[PDB]
Amino acid sequence: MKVPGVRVRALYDYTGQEADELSFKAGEELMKISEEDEQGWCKGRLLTGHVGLYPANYVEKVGLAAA
């Protein structure tokens, strides 16, 4: 266990930027699996096992309080 899925929720309903990106719904939950890029792009997996890039700038965690 080194990089578990990071649970995030989208603040709006968007569908990638090209055909290689993931599609999420407003309030849907996704699990990031890779790191963020210079364009705020993050690679992850949806709960359905779908893989691709998702706009990190359009989502936030839904884990615990900020502290």
Binding site: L11, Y12, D37, Q39, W41, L53, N57
Partner: peptide, 15 residues
């Protein structure tokens, strides 16, 4: 990066 993202974000920031 792979491709030029939808970025910058749309809203929910400045409050």
């Amino acid at each position: 990066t792979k491709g030029p993202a939808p970025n910058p974000p749309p809203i929910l920031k400045v409050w």
